[PDB]
Design a protein around this nucleic acid. Structure first.
Length: 49
DNA sequence: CCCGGTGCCGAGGCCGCTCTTTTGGACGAAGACAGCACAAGCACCGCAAAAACGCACGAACGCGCAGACCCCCGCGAAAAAACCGCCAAGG
């Protein structure tokens, strides 16, 4: 490489936010009883606002 | 009674204080509440003392015989019961 590279060990930490705990998709599913709109929440297979 | 004027109710304008309404978007997870309890009736389980069924005894029923004694008849003696009457003392 034409440019030299800064290089060495550094202390890194893994945070709790992982993509597989955030990915969510919905085509159709449960709806609220009062308004008949998609429910809220990824855990409940909800929709996006 | 004409020229003029005052207080008067009346008039609108304006300043102050009270009420109302709203304050970014999206997403995630977890955790903890949701009236509720006390007094009651229809029905059940199971306990008190009255009840089931066998067995063996022997009591009481039956029958057959005995004869005692109770009923009934009789004739007369015996006696009270019945009848009649005067009258006194007690109700």
């Amino acid at each position: 490489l034409m440019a030299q590279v800064f290089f060495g060990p550094t202390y890194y930490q893994r945070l709790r936010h992982m993509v597989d705990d955030k990915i969510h998709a919905r085509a159709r599913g449960p709806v609220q009883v009062l308004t008949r709109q998609p429910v809220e929440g990824r855990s409940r297979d909800g929709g996006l606002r």
